[PDB]
Structure formats: structure tokens, C-alpha cells
Amino acid sequence: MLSRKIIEESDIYLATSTRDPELFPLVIDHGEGVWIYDVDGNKYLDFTSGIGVNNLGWPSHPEVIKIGIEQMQKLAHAAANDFYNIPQLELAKKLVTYSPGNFQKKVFFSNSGTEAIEASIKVVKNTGRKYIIAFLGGFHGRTFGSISLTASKAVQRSIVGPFMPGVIHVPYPNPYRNPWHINGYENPSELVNRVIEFIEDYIFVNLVPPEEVAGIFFEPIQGEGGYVIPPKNFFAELQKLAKKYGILLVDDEVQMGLGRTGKLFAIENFNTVPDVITLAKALGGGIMPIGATIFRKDLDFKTFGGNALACAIGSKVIDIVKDLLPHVNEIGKIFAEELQGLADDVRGIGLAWGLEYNEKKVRDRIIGESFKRGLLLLPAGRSAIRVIPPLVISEEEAKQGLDILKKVIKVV
Amino acid sequence: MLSRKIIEESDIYLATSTRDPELFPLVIDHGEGVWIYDVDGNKYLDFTSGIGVNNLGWPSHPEVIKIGIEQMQKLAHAAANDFYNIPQLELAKKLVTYSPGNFQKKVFFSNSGTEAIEASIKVVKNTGRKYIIAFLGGFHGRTFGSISLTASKAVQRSIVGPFMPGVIHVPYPNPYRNPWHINGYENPSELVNRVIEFIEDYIFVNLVPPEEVAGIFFEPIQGEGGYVIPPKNFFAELQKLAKKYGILLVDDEVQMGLGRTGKLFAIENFNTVPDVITLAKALGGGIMPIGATIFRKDLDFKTFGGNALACAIGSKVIDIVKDLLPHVNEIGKIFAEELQGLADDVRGIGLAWGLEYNEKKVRDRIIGESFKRGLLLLPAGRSAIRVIPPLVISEEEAKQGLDILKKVIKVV
Amino acid sequence: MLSRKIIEESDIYLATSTRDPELFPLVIDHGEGVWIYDVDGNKYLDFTSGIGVNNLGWPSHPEVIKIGIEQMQKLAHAAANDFYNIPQLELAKKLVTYSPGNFQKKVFFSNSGTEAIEASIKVVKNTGRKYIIAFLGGFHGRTFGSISLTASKAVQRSIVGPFMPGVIHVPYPNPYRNPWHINGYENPSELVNRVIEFIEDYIFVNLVPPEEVAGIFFEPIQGEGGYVIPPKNFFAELQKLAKKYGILLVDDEVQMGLGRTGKLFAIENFNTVPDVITLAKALGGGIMPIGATIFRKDLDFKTFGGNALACAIGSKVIDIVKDLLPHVNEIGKIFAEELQGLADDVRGIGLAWGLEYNEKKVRDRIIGESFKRGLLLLPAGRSAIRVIPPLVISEEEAKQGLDILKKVIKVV
Amino acid sequence: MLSRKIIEESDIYLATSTRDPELFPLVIDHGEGVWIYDVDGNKYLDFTSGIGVNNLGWPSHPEVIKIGIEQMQKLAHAAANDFYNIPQLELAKKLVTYSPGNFQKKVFFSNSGTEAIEASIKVVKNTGRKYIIAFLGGFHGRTFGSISLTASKAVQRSIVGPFMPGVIHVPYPNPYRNPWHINGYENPSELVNRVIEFIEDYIFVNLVPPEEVAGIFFEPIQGEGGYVIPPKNFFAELQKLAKKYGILLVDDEVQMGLGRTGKLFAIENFNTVPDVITLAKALGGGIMPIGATIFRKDLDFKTFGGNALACAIGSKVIDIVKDLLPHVNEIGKIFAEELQGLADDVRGIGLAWGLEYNEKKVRDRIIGESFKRGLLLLPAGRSAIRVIPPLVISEEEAKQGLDILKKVIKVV
Numbered sequence A, B, C, D: 001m002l003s004r005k006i007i008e009e010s011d012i013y014l015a016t017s018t019r020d021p022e023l024f025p026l027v028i029d030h031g032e033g034v035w036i037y038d039v040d041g042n043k044y045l046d047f048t049s050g051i052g053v054n055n056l057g058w059p060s061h062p063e064v065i066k067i068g069i070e071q072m073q074k075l076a077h078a079a080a081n082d083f084y085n086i087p088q089l090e091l092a093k094k095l096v097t098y099s100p101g102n103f104q105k106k107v108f109f110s111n112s113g114t115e116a117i118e119a120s121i122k123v124v125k126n127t128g129r130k131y132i133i134a135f136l137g138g139f140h141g142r143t144f145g146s147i148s149l150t151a152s153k154a155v156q157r158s159i160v161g162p163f164m165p166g167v168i169h170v171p172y173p174n175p176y177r178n179p180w181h182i183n184g185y186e187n188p189s190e191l192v193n194r195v196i197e198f199i200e201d202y203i204f205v206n207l208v209p210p211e212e213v214a215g216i217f218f219e220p221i222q223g224e225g226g227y228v229i230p231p232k233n234f235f236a237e238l239q240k241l242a243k244k245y246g247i248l249l250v251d252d253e254v255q256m257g258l259g260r261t262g263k264l265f266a267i268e269n270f271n272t273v274p275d276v277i278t279l280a281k282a283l284g285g286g287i288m289p290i291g292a293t294i295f296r297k298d299l300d301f302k303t304f305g306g307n308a309l310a311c312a313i314g315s316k317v318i319d320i321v322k323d324l325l326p327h328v329n330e331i332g333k334i335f336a337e338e339l340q341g342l343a344d345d346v347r348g349i350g351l352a353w354g355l356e357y358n359e360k361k362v363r364d365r366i367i368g369e370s371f372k373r374g375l376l377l378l379p380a381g382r383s384a385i386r387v388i389p390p391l392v393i394s395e396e397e398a399k400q401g402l403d404i405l406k407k408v409i410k411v412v
């Protein structure tokens, strides 16, 4: 029972950071593929992917580990961009070239998704405009700038506010639950129109001149919000509104990017080209933190190290993800078929799935009982569960996990 | 001439980020010890230490690389603290135990120095107080919260402001150049008194109730500001003022900590125990980014991964630094002796040295000509140079660098 | 043609301040009762009441003028509250005693409605809470604090923002036009529920902890917004939500108070007792500016003159208004009967009437042609007209104005 | 003893608003010339002028009262500028014509000094610049925008902050007490240089780009700060700095303007032409509140009433003040001669005098004992007394007051 002792001692020295309700503690020793092992030898099937960090497995993909060990002994990661280096150049080229839009783009590297978002804030404000529009339910980070854009759980913004002024939050086109009580699955256009109208006919009329809005920040699919997928043409309509006033569109792909939805960039599913994109988590292959902010060249700006290790890893990650897309979409069909009817709302694309329950207590029990069966799941939104297995998962491993989930749901 | 081509192509894809004046470009291939090698085979002696990131050499210390390669294959770095793990527990124990003060402390891990500072802002505001005092010339990071505390170069805060309200900046006790034109070396007490008076008799009288000031942020020695060392009893006096009103003291050791000044924590040189401390850069051994925010337990608060790789590395870093302190102070005497009279102001402690020139152009030339001789140096403040060789540097390597610097200064 | 010359010369020396579209210029010489006379001898029937300032006629009521001339020669108006004086005491007593709620209250005097609102902001924040909720379409003043709460026309908040942080705007229960496209006249409960739900299930869930919301600011009937009257039980429901979290209710009666709606305080029509109330405009009888902020005694706080002239006038105003209420409601029935079917939406209570047209151009023409007939009207909202004759208007004078309005509407 | 009863009852209904220490209560019935009479028949010689409001006597000047009674019966004061009217045109002409600078200017009317300052904030920000510099010890109003610029007593900014971001406060050139401990009377140039240096070499270097500073706000002589008169060439040097970066100079004359210092505009004593000027208090003749914001025409911008009563009064006030300047400067010599040696620092110009005592308790006693002798005085700064008799005071009345003050100072 090494775990209990480690947990107790750790709780003494570490700052408090738990969910509500809090999940069962896990003292991990190591990982392999889609499996995690605690210090007591217990095995766990991972359906969390570390929320993106481990899209390619644990501790990472074999080819990525190989790259890391080699590069680390040459030039590591100073989280700085001063030192020109081949790895940095190669990853930059891939990120600008494979991202949506065939216009010239540039990339700014950072150490995390929140830093990538902080950089995006600077980019959109470089225009001279002062206001930013974001969405209720959205999550973009915890640093002061990023948390000003975040609006997931009120408690997360407690005590230390107020936050950055000039940020306005509006309803997201959540097809299952929204302020208009519209069924976004049956009437997608109606929901999209109400959301666009709220911005254009109210926010832009009563509160802020649209010409002073620097940009609109959004997740192509809300992660922390509960894996909420908006109507297919929502971003096309949002862009129409934005273009009308010269407002920039910032696509936060920190959690949905790099293969999660079966596309290199989740926004591709919505056939929309954003002005700025943020990446992180999976970009580092599960080995290390690295963030990236891709943006139209015409928006460019005006430490002492070289981030070679992180970039070398990211470069390999991009190649593996691209090679895996067909597999991701194939395995995704299994989740689509097997998850049907397992929740009050079952929504997903690629390997990005969400299960929402009208009963929060039921949601908590499903996660709790699943953990007791050796299946790792994470909550999302108010009463949903995110089902996000590593992109490298096999059909066989997927069914092992789904069988456990189905059995748990049947008894809870 | 592989370098030129890499530089050109990289400038096309990467966001603009250069100094003023901009330093000579460097396309690094790999490093070993205190030496750096570019893609064209050119060798460089490093007197920058990556501003802390590479305190233990390039790409890092052999023992740290060993730890990294091993741990990376077990459980890497998710930049999250959810996953309990032995490495995390061990580093946490070292950071709370070896930091100043024998009272109970806790530690919150992050991915960088700016994130560590963002966390410290939340910690001091958890009290309910709204104002923060920082120092002119100080540098604490670039994210929205941290940059609100930063006041190094005005251009760095251009375009995208205003910033976080409630932050007040006051003069730092810079012994060489200050608003009072006091020679802080001859009259340290006078300078300290003027600085304390400015806060207590003006800021606290005219602008903000001291009882509403959450904390005072400071660097024990200003880094970006030009390696400005304040009078020895400055922090003792600052703490007296703070205790009087229940104001917290936040010691930013991101650049001066972990051995740079011959002490594990630079504040030790000032015999003062802070309430909160931030660490980063060197903590990750030059292999990866990791930040830490240490604070009194009574200030504690109320993702899904395990930062084992970064913590395992940090744990080893702490042991190596502690073992190296005697060496650092010994080599420091060489710099103290050899740097005398080489600038209009020569100031330093341990291996933290600053050379300030009344003539900025002269400062720029010294750095430029040194680069042409194969010696890497970084500017600081308005017209100073920071001389910060890796802590693992030998007497022989130190003299090679000092000989070059002396020769350059003599001809410029 | 003295007018044209005065207008031209005045436009040279005065700062630009015009509506869009701009109304016809008026160079007033004097007034009497409900009639205004320009410098060229042209007579105008006033249906604007100076938006409250002249509720009792022009230049004011005879009894008020008498009081003013007498008091002015004793102790005038220093816009200060330092000097104790009988007039101040008497008005204070009337304001605390006749305002809703039988609990102990206090009053803070100021010089305008925007200053009264600025004072209310301080009052609600004295609690220690940092957030404020206000309504889209609302208007509370133009000074920095008040304009942060205002959200009438975006252009009014242009250029000089961002504004006070921590202010969140939500939809008002406008029965004619709202984000839900609900007909608030046919389904009032549905609209009220959607508005309350937006705050409780979205704002309080995603954005801000309700326990940190200092207060909710609202107009009992939106003035600048277009004389928008919410469902009768809206404030009762709003108060239920507020009480649940200890949030204060601030009732801005600067435009709707003092008899306009047939009640001393417009909120009386909604059977709700607020925590704070702001008054201005009519309070000064049309003779001078004076604002008042009435609030529960338990919220009290912790220059060198005496506002006797303004208070003496206000005291008389209160008595005249109370005596006139029966008359106001009687004349109101005439407007109710005669205005029916004259606009796409006809809404009103007492002598507070609004006429909204789906066609903005039609709205502008009605106001313009009316001015050419000698009837003064003001626009409101996006395409509405406010019809607010002085409370002292006779049935005969009312019909003269209504006949003109009807004829204009019939030809436009 | 009618007073005591009025005070008790008034304290029950009125919001708390007292000084620290609090002055003796005064229940004023009426006034005449420079004399005030309470409800119990007690007579008081006024050396406060209501801090400007009553520069022309109590309740006001006979000629002003005449104008007021007449105009009030024609068109009063709606605190609005919509209604063109002769009085408004005439006052506007006088304010633009007689203010410093022969370039084209415009004027925006408001209801108070704080509103005039709020308007000035909008004017300087209309440029697009976001930062504002103000001075420690300064006072510009209590509304949210104005209080953000104010920095007199910290307690005044307690509880309800933080305030408007982008406002930076720097030391004022106070010749008696400043952060540099410079004797500004013996070494004025030294003090001016230190103040200019603080802004140019520190604020503009470390904190904010000067090109982003909209304006510098200042009082030509700090009022609440203690009637602090800066060196004669301070504003000339301040303007040189401002012109260098296109920064605007805002001169707040709300307390020092309109004859107080022997000049129509106090800045005239410093031979400097500002870009924006604010006026209030005395402008209304002691009869009513009216504010004015005068500014260069090239800075112009892009309710329903006519402020005729207030403007008619202001127009007369301007003529009387201009006629009285010779008298003010003459009587001023008496105060200069008679006040010498009566305090630790005696400073003044025209009829604007300040007496500072190193002993605060002594300062409080002088004011208290003076009140007991029937002489009204107000405190200022930390331990000073402002001596500001009405501009209409006779030599005989001045000596009566000075004799009392001298006797009190001799026994305290």
C-alpha cells in the first residue's frame, strides 16, 4: 500500500488542487501504450489521454521517445526562441503549412496552452482594438489574461477578480442546452441564428462598437464545457459576422487539435479558416509542454536559449498524427455505434466524445465505478463525461474499455 | 554556410522577436559543458547560462541527462499535478525544506517563471487584498498578470495595455543610479531610507491604504534591470514595513535562485525570509521548463497528468546545486578580482556579475566584439552587461572567457 | 431670425453634442407652463418634460419658483452636505420616509443622476463584493463609473474604453423585442423566466460566483432604451434571485421617479422594495441639478457648504408631486385611449408613454414633422418615441398635443 | 439651542460624511457678505469661501443674485446643453476668449468639478492614447474616473478600488516636503529637475511609452494637498517634456481658478498655456453647481434642456472677478505681511494662502480654537490650514479675521 503513504505525504507539501467532486487519487509509476500502472502494480485503461497531452500513448509514442532521447543530448529545451535551430525551423514550417488557409502565416512558440492564448491576446490587440468576445462555457487557460477569457465554472474565477476589462461573454451554440431551449440537433440553423443575433443585434448595438472588437475567441468544440459540438455551419456564420467588421477569429485548438477529432485541426470539420490558432498539450507528445500560436503574417509583432528538444518532438508528433488520421476516424465509428443510447445526450466526432446526463449524481457514479473497474474517465461541463482514448488505441483495447463503461452504466 | 540559410528561412516562418540593438544570430547545433557549437562548427564559450536555464551546463549536467532519459521512459511531463508520483513528492519536499523559514510551506508547480508569478499573484490576492507593489526596473514575466508587475523597458508594455489595475511601481534601491542620485555604495542606509520613505510616507499616505496591499514583489537582485544589487539590509527594512501592515513579501528567484549568487536562494544573502518564492529556468536543468511557487502553508488555495520527468530532473538539480555552492563562491572570487575596473560600475556576488557603462554604445560594442571572439554575453538594463557563466565552469574556462572580455574592453 | 445667428456662433464655441439623426435646433428664450418660446417668438408645446427635469412645467412650478427666490437670498447651493440646514433635513426626511420599505434608510445628496449612480456603486461595493450586473439597453449616466453600467447605444461607449471591470450586462425583459423573440405581453412569465434563467443558470454558473456580486442595477422602466416596461412581476422574481445570494437591488429612478408613472417611485408599480434608489432630474424642480441616493441604513459609509437652495426646492417638489398623482393617472387614461394603434407598439403607465415603430425612418419623420407643427418630442431606443408631457398638463393641453401627433402620424 | 436638535435628527437621515478629525458642526441659517449666521444667531467670519463656491460672498454677490432671480423665471438650469440660449453663448465666449492661449478653443459644460474632470479624461483619451499621469497629493474629484486621478488621502480611495487602469502618479514639486528632501524655496530648479527626471528617466523608461500617454493632469496649486505652490518655472519645464511626446496638459482650476490667486486663471502665474482647463465651484457664484471644460478646438468630440440660469450667473461671475483682480492682489499683500512667521511654512499668492505646521495636533487646535472665536478655517494636506477669504473681503474684515488667527496661534 505504497500509494496511501505517498498521497498523505504529498498532500502535506503540495498546494491544494482538487475537483468537485474530487476523483479517486492515482499514484502513477509508469505507463505503456494506453495502459497506466500505479505504484502498487494496479493496471488502468486510459480513456482520458491526459486531455490531449497523451494523444499518442504513455509515456509517449516509441518514435517520439527515440527522438527525445537523442535530441535531449544535443540541445534541450530552454523555452526560448532566440537560438535558431533546425528542429524549430522544421516544426514552424509544418505548423504554418498544414494549418488552414494558404496565405502566409507565422508561429510564436511558448510553454503551454495558456501562454499560447496570452500570446494570441497580444496578437489581436496589436491591431489597436480593445475588446474581445468569448463564449460562456469556454476555457482558455488560468493565467490572468487567459482566465479573463475563460468562463467554464464560476468558482474558477472566484476571489481574485475582477479580470481583464473589455472581455464580453456570449452564449455558445450548445445544441443540447442553451438559453433559448432550442434543440440544436433538430434545429441547428435556428440556434446558430439566435447566437449570431445576440452578438450582432444586442452586443454590437447596446454595448460595444463592433469596429473596436479585436477578436472573437472560441473552441471549435468546447472541452471543459463538456465536449459541446456546435452546428456544422456555425463558424461559417460567425466568420461572416466577423469579416463584416474586421474582427479576427481565434481558434483555440489546445484540446481538440492534432488528431483528436479525426483532423489535424478540429476547425477543419467546420470548413472555416481562422485568423489565429493556438496549440499545446498533444504538441509536446506527452513528453513536455510546448505551446504554439499560429497567425496570419500581417499580424506579426514588431531570454537566451533554443527550444530544440520540444520542437524536434513536435515535428515528429505532427507526422505521426497525420499518419493516424484514417485510423482515428475508423475507431471513431466504433465509439459512435457503441456509445449510442448510453447517456441523455451522446455527441462526438473522431475520438472526441461526450456523454451528458441530466442527473449529475449519476454522472459522478459512472466515473467513480469505472475507476473501480480500472477505467479512467474525466468529467466535463456540469454533468457530462468526456471519452477521449489515445489516438493509438486498437479496436481490441477500445472494446475492452467500452465493455466496462457499458456495464457500469447499466448498474448505475 | 548552413547558418545563413537556416536564419533566412526561419525568419520567414517565425514571429518577430529581437532585442534592440539585436544581437548576432546564432544557429546552435549542440552543446557540451560551457561550450556551444553552431551548425557551421564554430565554437562558443558561454557566459550567459541561458539566463539561468543552463546553470549546470549544456545541454545540461551529465547526471541530469541520465535521470531525464530514464524517467522519460516511465512517466514524462504533463505539466499537470493531478497524478501523484514519487518524483513530484521528492522535489516538493526539497523545495519546502531547503527554502528560507522553518515554518510549514507548500509548493505549487507550473510550467515557467511567468506562470509561477501568475500563481503568486493569486496567492497574495487570496487574502482579499487588492493592491500590489512592485519595483521600477523589475521583471516578472510576459503574460498579462506578470507583465502588469514588470517594469523593465517601457516598449515591452507598449500597444496592448492598460494592464492589471491596482499595481503600483516604486523606485528600487539601485546603488549606482536612482531618482535621488544617492551613491548607494557609500551611503546604503540613506538610499534604503529614501526607498522605504517613498512607500510609507507617500504611496501609503496619498494613494493606497497599506492594509489593502496584498504584497510587495521584488527580485533579490534585478536581472533584466542590469544585475542591480541592493544594500545588504534593504529587505530587512522592507520586511519591517510589510509586517507593520500585514503585507506579504514575494521573492522572485526565477533568475537569481538555485546557486547563481552562491546560495540556493539569493535572498539568503540578505538574511530575510520571504512569504512567497518563485523559481523556474534553472529548476528544469536546461532540459525543460518547470516553475515552482513556494509559500507559507496558511496561504494555500481552497488537467489530468503527472509532472514526473520535470520533477525528477528538478530533484537532481537541487542536489547538484547544493554540492556546487562552495565551488561557485570560489570561482566568484576570480570574477570579483578580474572584473574590477572593467566598467563604470562593477557589481556582483557569487557568479552573478554586472558591468555597467555610462556609454551605451560602448556596452553594445563590447558585447558585439566579444561575440566575434567566440564569447557569448547578454545586455541588461540600459547600458550594462550581465556576466553569468554556468555554475559548473572551471577556473581554466573562466579565465579563458575573462581574458577575451578584458582584451575586448581594452580596444573598445 | 435671431435664432440662426445664435446657433452659428454657439456651434463655434461649444463642444459637439448632437443626436443621430440630430433633432431640429431650438433657441429657447423662456417658458411658461407646458409651453416653450424661442428667441423669434415661436411657441412650442412640450411633450418632453426635459426628460424629467421639467415634470412640473417651465421654467418650473410657480410655488417652486417662489421657494427658490426666497431661499437663494438666504443660503444657496454649494453642492456640499457639510453645512447642516433645515431644508436639507426636511428633504432627507421626505426621501427616506416616502421611499419604499419601512426599514431605516439614509440619503446621500449629489449634483446629478450620474453622480447619484456613482455613489450607489460605492454603496454596493462597500460590502466587499466586486461584481455588478446591469441590463442591456440600460442607461445610468456618462461619468466613468456610471457609463460602465450604461449599455444603451454602443457609440456612447466608443473610443475611450475599456470601462470598469467586473460589470456584466444581461438581457432586460423587453416584452416587444428580446433575444428570445418572446411576446412579453402574451407570455410575460415565459420572458421573465428566460431572463432570470440567463442570470442564474449561465452567468452565475459559468462566469461569476453569485456571492461576489455586489448588486443588480436596473431602471424600473428603461428610459433611453425606449420606455420599455417589463412584466409586472419581473422585479419580484429578480428580488427572489437576489435575496438568495445576498445581492443588492439598485433601482435607478432618475428618469421614471417622482410622479412620471403615476407613483412617487416607479418601482411601486411592481410591488418591490429595492435596497438602493437614485433620484435626480425632476428632484430639482427644473431649477437646478440635485441627485439623491437612498439606501438601507445598514449600508452607510464610514467640500464646505450647504445645499439649502436645492433641498428647499426638492422638498416642495415632493409635496407637489404627491398632490398631483391622482391627476397624473387621470390624464394618463387619455394618453392610453388616444395613443392606441398609433405605433407598432404602444406601451405606457401614468404619463410615461412609448411608441415604437418597426420603421426607424418613420419614427424620425414623426418627430421631425411634429417639431414643424410646434410639438416637441424625443426619440428613444432604436426606433421609438417617448411621450412624456409635464405632470401639470391639463386635459385641454394634452389633447392639443395628441391631435397634432395623430395628424402627423396619419400623413407620415 | 435649535442647532443641537437639527444636528441629531440630520445625523439620523443623512449618510455619514465627516473629516478626520471632524470639524465643529455648523447649522447655517443664512449669510451676508463674508459673514455666516447659524440658526441660533451666532455670527461667523468666513475664511473658507466654501473652497471656491463662495469666492464672491454669501449667499453670493448682490449683482449675481439679481441675475439669478431674473433668469430663473425665464429659463432655469436643466444641466443640459441641448437648448441653445443667449446666456450659454455668452459664458462660452468669455471662457474661450479669456482663457490662456489665442488659438481656437471650445467649452463643454457639466454640473460639477468632478464631472468637468470626467469630461477632460474623455477629451485626452479621444486621441487614442491610454495612459494618464497625475500627481501624488492631487485632488480631482470623487466619481470613478476622477478619483482614479485623485491621490490626496489614501482613505478616500479605500474599500471600493481598484480604480481606472493606466493612471500613474508621480511626485509633485512640493517645495516644503518632497521625496528628495529638497528645500524647493532655496533650490527650486533642483526640485523641478528631480520631478521632471522622475517622469522622463524612470516612468517613461521603465513603465510606459511616452507616446501612449494621453495627458498629464495637475492643479496649478494643490488645494486639498495643502495649498502647495510649485516653483515658478515648473509648468514651463513640464510643458517642454509634454510637447516632446505630444502629451496634453490638463490644468485643473476648479479650486484655484476665477480670481483666487489674483488671476482669472491660476496657471497665468506660471506663464504656461495648457491644452485643457477645468472650472467649477466659483463659476456658479455660490448659487449653483456648474462645471466647464475648456480645450483646444482640435480635440473636440464627434438630455433635453437649457442651462441658462447657471450660464447667466457664470457670465456675471466672470465680469465681477475680472473687476476684482486688482483688489484681490492688494488685500493679498496684507495676508502676506500679517501671516509671516505664523506657521512652520507660510506660502501664498493672491488670496490663496497655506499655513503648514510640523505638529498636526497644533494644526487641529488652531482650527478648533479659531472656530470657538467665530472664525471659520479648513484643514488641508496632512497638517496645514488653508486661509482663503472671499475675494470681496474688505481690508477691515480681513484684519478682524487675521487678528483672531494671530491670537489663537499665540496661545496654542
Ligand SMILES: *Cc1c(COP(=O)(O)O)cnc(C)c1O
Pocket: A111, A112, A113, A114, A115, A117, A139, A140, A141, A142, A219, A223, A224, A252, A253, A254, A255, A280, A281, B079, B303
Ligand atoms: C487545457 C486547455 C488550455 C490550457 O492549456 P495549458 O497547457 O494547461 O495552459 C487552454 N485552452 C483550452 C481549450 C484547453 O483545453
Ligand SMILES: *Cc1c(COP(=O)(O)O)cnc(C)c1O
Pocket: A079, A303, B111, B112, B113, B114, B115, B117, B139, B140, B141, B142, B219, B223, B224, B252, B253, B254, B255, B280, B281
Ligand atoms: C526570466 C524571468 C521571468 C520569466 O521566466 P519565464 O520562464 O521566461 O516565464 C520571471 N521573473 C524573473 C525575475 C525572470 O528573470
Ligand SMILES: *Cc1c(COP(=O)(O)O)cnc(C)c1O
Pocket: C111, C112, C113, C114, C115, C117, C139, C140, C141, C142, C219, C223, C224, C252, C253, C254, C255, C280, C281, D079, D303
Ligand atoms: C438621465 C439619466 C441619468 C443621468 O442623469 P444626469 O443628471 O444627466 O447625470 C441616469 N440614469 C437614468 C435612468 C437616466 O434617465
Ligand SMILES: *Cc1c(COP(=O)(O)O)cnc(C)c1O
Pocket: C079, C303, D111, D112, D113, D114, D115, D117, D139, D140, D141, D142, D219, D223, D224, D252, D253, D254, D255, D280, D281
Ligand atoms: C473640489 C475640487 C474638485 C471637485 O469639484 P466638485 O464640484 O466637488 O466635483 C475637483 N478638482 C479640484 C482641484 C478641486 O479642488
